[PDB]
Amino acid sequence: SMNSDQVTLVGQVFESYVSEYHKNDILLILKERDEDAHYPVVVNAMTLFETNMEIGEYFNMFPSEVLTIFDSALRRSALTILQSLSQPEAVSMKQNLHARISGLPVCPELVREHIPKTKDVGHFLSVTGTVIRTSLVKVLEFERDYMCNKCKHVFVIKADFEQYYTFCPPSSCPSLESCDSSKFTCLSGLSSSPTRCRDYQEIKIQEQVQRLSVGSIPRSMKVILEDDLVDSCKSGDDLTIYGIVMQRWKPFQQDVRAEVEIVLKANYIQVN
């Protein structure tokens, strides 16, 4: 992963870029009414990567974690802009901010007309295709709260995207004080204290045979939409999808056969 030295520089370069080129974009988000909704901030990667050389290297190396760092810099930039207003009570802070990457440097390794292959797993790139199928939006739980039997420390576990958002019970207390306790209790179903549930949607895109590069039989691909990306396209649209190539899988069981799948975890959708 990245050490604190690299995480600091990444967030600080992004924070200054946003606070200089997207000041009004954050102001409009702050001016919105619904505080629990998810709001995007769209950024041109090409212009961003030109301000700093290391930011583009870490992004292409650790896209998932760099995007997480970007979201932390958006909340700090939002709170700074909010505190600069003469009447900060006229707007409301928004905690669900997502950095959505658009405009990658145009090159064959990042902008694709074909379905990415196994070699491309883990990389952030764009795929252009046509929507052939959309599913209904589903509400899914992505985090579950637990507590320690010895310290009463409430912690959370993350649903594994690669295993279709399934949870695995831990056996180590992640409290600040080293607890040897392996006994924990599940608090997810006992109450609905938070609404930590996300919108989820699957679409199917296919290569466009009307393209010179696409041969006779086009291939298809599942794209996962989450948060504010759901309901952003319909069957028939021409989409350019920016995101991370990933593998979802289910192991063999007693009577069940295994299945592995290459999908695209969308980060931005551009309708053409």
Least separation in angstroms between CB 176 and Zn ion: 9
Stretch that binds Zn ion, among 109-117, 143-151, 194-202, 260-268 (CB under 5 A): 143-151
Q: Which helix (H) or strand (E) holds 199?
A: strand 197-206
Q: Considering the rule CB under 5 A, would residue 214 count as an interface residue with Na ion?
A: yes
Query: Which has the closest alpha carbon to 95: 84, 82, 107?
Result: 82
Tell me the site size for Zn ion, rule CB under 5 A: 7
Residue number with CB closer to Na ion (149 or 206):
206
List the one residue from 52, 72, 80, 175 that touches Zn ion (CB under 5 A): 175
Least distance (Å) between residue 254 CB and Zn ion = 36
Selection from Zn ion, Na ion, none that 151 binds (CB < 5 to 8 A by kind) is Zn ion
DSSP 25-60: HHHHHHH-S-SSS-EEEEEEHHHHHHH-HHHHHHHH
Residues 6+ apart with CB under 8 A from 258: 249, 250, 251, 252
Residue 148: which of Zn ion, Na ion, none does it interact with, CB under 5 to 8 A by kind?
Zn ion
| Count of residues making up the chain | 272
Exactly one of 45, 69, 91, 148 binds Zn ion (CB under 5 A); that residue is 148
In the complex, least distance from residue 151 CB atom to Zn ion, rounded to whole angstroms: 4
Q: Of all residues in this chain, which one has the CB nearest to Na ion in the complex?
A: 214
Task: Kindly indicate which of the ranges 36-44, 45-53, 141-149, 215-223 contains the residues binding Zn ion, using the contact rule CB under 5 A.
Answer: 141-149
> Burial, 255: exposed, middle or buried (Cβ in 10 Å; 0-12, 13-18, 19+)?
exposed
Q: What is the side-by-side order of every strand in the sheet holding 143-148?
A: 154-158, 143-148, 184-186
Residue 258 to residue 250: CA distance in whole angstroms: 5
Q: Which residues are near Zn ion by CB under 5 A?
A: 148, 150-151, 173, 175, 179, 181
